[PDB]
Design a protein around this ligand. Sequence first.
Ligand code: HEM
Ligand code: HEM
Ligand SMILES: N=C(NCCC[C@H](N)C(=O)N[C@@H](CCN)C(N)=O)N[N+](=O)[O-]
Ligand SMILES: N=C(NCCC[C@H](N)C(=O)N[C@@H](CCN)C(N)=O)N[N+](=O)[O-]
Ligand SMILES: C[C@H](O)[C@H](O)[C@H]1CNc2nc(N)[nH]c(=O)c2N1
Ligand SMILES: C[C@H](O)[C@H](O)[C@H]1CNc2nc(N)[nH]c(=O)c2N1
Ligand SMILES: OC[C@@H](O)[C@@H](O)[C@H](O)[C@H](O)CO
Ligand SMILES: OC[C@@H](O)[C@@H](O)[C@H](O)[C@H](O)CO
Ligand SMILES: [Zn+2]
Lengths: 407, 410
Amino acid sequence: RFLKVKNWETDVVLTDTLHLKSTLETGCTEHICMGSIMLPTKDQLFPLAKEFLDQYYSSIKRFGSKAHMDRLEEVNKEIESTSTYQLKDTELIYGAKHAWRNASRCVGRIQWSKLQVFDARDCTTAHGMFNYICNHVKYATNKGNLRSAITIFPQRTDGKHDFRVWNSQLIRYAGYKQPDGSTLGDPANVQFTEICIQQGWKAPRGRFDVLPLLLQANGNDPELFQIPPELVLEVPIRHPKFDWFKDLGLKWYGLPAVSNMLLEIGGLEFSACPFSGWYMGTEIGVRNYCDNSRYNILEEVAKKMDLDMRKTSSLWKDQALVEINIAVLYSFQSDKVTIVDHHSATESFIKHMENEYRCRGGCPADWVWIVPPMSGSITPVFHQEMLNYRLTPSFEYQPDPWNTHVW
Amino acid sequence: RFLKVKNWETDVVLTDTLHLKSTLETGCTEHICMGSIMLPVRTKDQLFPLAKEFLDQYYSSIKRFGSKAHMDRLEEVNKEIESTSTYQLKDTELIYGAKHAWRNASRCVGRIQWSKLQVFDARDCTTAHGMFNYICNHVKYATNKGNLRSAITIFPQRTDGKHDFRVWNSQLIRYAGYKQPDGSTLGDPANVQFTEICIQQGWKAPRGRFDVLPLLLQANGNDPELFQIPPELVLEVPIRHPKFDWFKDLGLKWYGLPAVSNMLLEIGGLEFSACPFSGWYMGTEIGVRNYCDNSRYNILEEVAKKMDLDMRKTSSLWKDQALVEINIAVLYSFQSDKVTIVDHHSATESFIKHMENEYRCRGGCPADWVWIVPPMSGSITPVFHQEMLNYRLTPSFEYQPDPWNTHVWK
Ligand code: HEM
Ligand code: HEM
Ligand SMILES: N=C(NCCC[C@H](N)C(=O)N[C@@H](CCN)C(N)=O)N[N+](=O)[O-]
Ligand SMILES: N=C(NCCC[C@H](N)C(=O)N[C@@H](CCN)C(N)=O)N[N+](=O)[O-]
Ligand SMILES: C[C@H](O)[C@H](O)[C@H]1CNc2nc(N)[nH]c(=O)c2N1
Ligand SMILES: C[C@H](O)[C@H](O)[C@H]1CNc2nc(N)[nH]c(=O)c2N1
Ligand SMILES: OC[C@@H](O)[C@@H](O)[C@H](O)[C@H](O)CO
Ligand SMILES: OC[C@@H](O)[C@@H](O)[C@H](O)[C@H](O)CO
Ligand SMILES: [Zn+2]
């Protein structure tokens, strides 16, 4: 019941006791592992609230205290009467930070305690949501010196007045399927891009068009808004040696801001909780640019580098891949925009894991997601065994709203 | 129950029904995933059912399920187990068994080749000298002057656990590792302990950077004995680069035949503790892991310097640049010397085709994503984007503790 994890490069062994607090299912069983699978009532609520509040008061060293007991009863009576309850600001902050701390797929959790939390629970309309969002983007961007932040909108009530940010991230590029049959822009956003058009947006039909926010407040139909262009920091991509690189016409936005996840704290569900930190280089250079279903620029770059693309064994794709990633990092650093390379980030994650095992008894981690998409084994996490389990507070996936909204 | 796996690059979705025949446990629970953990005598009682399951599978494979031949074999084996507490496989069953252990190996990306395995039956072997001869023959056949052929040599199964046949080497061919008084290592760090055992057993170590280790062979539970593999039988490739003439002066080379010799082959409940097998290398095994792991030859620095890369900051990605060149060098050298090798792009592409074929004709293909995805350029290979299901099917290859930790010395 006390599992051990070993690093096969340093031989360091850590013992995990934290996993014994996990409640939710992993998708795996004694017969089958689903580790590589992407997506594996008043009576229900109070126990969840109790679990959360107990961990909260324990964190502030007041477990068992009258305050602890008083709060517990207050919430209890609130659920019995209102069928729900409201978190204190302190509980909200502690909850959001811990949902990040518990995110097993995030390699940047060494930064978890520094999260800026924006309480938007007083929001009532989409226009109010737009305002809170612009403020988050401006705050988080900080002229290039990115600061992690989350903005939390009202919690779910009966499920028919949910607040939702239809976008997958606050800032993304549109995608349109052209006559040729090809795709212009980001193929990943082809569908969302049309839903925007399907009701208003006027697309420049470019390769890198910033999508408009489609905000849904109180269950009402979503409304479009253009993020003040001046608030969207973008970085033109060039290479520190290949002067022809800039000719590729490539750029990427500086703020990664997941906006479609669900934040669960003490049983409460916050369906609109956009958060942002900063990029790990490979996210852009390896995945966004080189995935065959994304901008898929490997061939173009290989051709400009004049590499023998006749055979796979010449490793031309690999050589081009490295160059594209050196460019991305070079470009962001040159424009003084925060970004971290996979070596540095993974090194920090190992440090974080050790801290967590020492001070918390463990660190849920998903190896499949933690190991960078390029040069896996030359990063320390590849050699690190990890135990994946679910702890709450948590960030969860949720269905795209267009597949559930009743207009 | 049907289980769906999706490929996030092509949106192709496959349905798995094969997992229903999984018996062994994975190490995971409905509460914790141990997907990245490296390692998470039978009774007459527990043996016939294991035998029955296997023979049922075997007979169904040859389209003779339920036949008189099928029923007689089951009766023959049952009587044999009741009578001797164990049983012997027919040559055909052993061949079928070995091929399927490979076919079921979740961590192997080269399984598109499974049906082509050459099985050498060494169950009549009784001594360590006998084992050496069988192993020499395996290496010569498999090497085939560079046109590698996959093969497996199978020694006598376990009986009471006190007469085990074991190849103490982790692979038939590996380089010695020597821990120096100053704390540094000469040779391959991965083999320091085994090298010390060899020396203690009498091996005269040339103490170089690439000394092929001698075989330490255990027959019938007796103490192991040392044998030197005929040098003329050990094919090696000097490593050089197509554009960098200084690469060759790094003094690197690697053996051409990868031959895992420490796993246990389980077939129909029987345990074959000595079953060396070989195929051929995927370049990253050598170029990424053996050469670039910090705990192995660790050559990234020396290579990076010679390329005059900016090593002042990791963000120059000098490690990644050097890495690619080293792997280019490994592939180029093997191809130049006409020694079979496969690059990670070709191997992963073939594995995806193999996997889809298996779903269609078999109902599944257990696969360990953590092991299948190559150690470099992960997402530019199709397997990175492929959801996999990992489960254990028998026949199978299993880990077993190193023999020096369990052997009762005589
Ligand atoms: C500040 C530095 C940060 C860095 C460098 C970072 C890096 C990463 C990376 C590289 C991924 C994988 C992304 C992908 O492949 O799609 C990721 C995933 C994730 N991160 Fe972090 N992160 C940071 C901040 C945050 C913050 C502020 C939160 C939450 C408040 C967070 C929550 C998550 C979650 C929940 C996932 C998994 C999302 C999914 O399943 O798609 N991260 N992070
Ligand atoms: C013919 C070409 C072959 C190729 C290219 C291939 C490639 C690989 C590679 C790249 C690995 C991972 C090795 C590591 O990282 O340590 C592997 C693992 C494995 N392969 Fe294959 N393989 C081949 C043949 C074979 C054969 C002949 C068998 C058995 C009859 C086999 C059984 C296995 C097993 C059981 C493992 C997992 C070993 C472990 O867990 O440590 N492979 N293979
Ligand atoms: N570095 C970050 N990267 C997040 C990148 C999100 C990723 N590009 C993405 O598309 N995620 C999908 C989920 C795909 N599993 C989504 N949020 O809809 N996050 N951050 O706050 O610092
Ligand atoms: N390509 C192959 N590669 C196998 C390479 C074996 C690997 N280098 C190794 O050291 N395996 C450990 C097992 C580590 N899990 C052992 N055999 O003791 N196999 N083949 O048959 O062609
Ligand atoms: C199928 C497989 O789960 C999928 O391709 C995963 C693998 N690891 C990943 N890791 C990260 N960080 N991000 C991803 O999108 C993925 N995709
Ligand atoms: C800790 C982690 O499981 C370990 O480093 C694994 C990862 N994937 C691997 N994949 C292959 N092919 N070979 C290995 O030795 C490993 N090591
Ligand atoms: O075009 C819409 C897509 O961006 C959307 O469906 C995402 O795939 C989804 O939000 C999960 O990332
Ligand atoms: O030097 C001994 C090692 O080669 C040996 O203990 C291996 O680690 C073991 O066979 C697993 O690979
Ligand atoms: Zn699992």
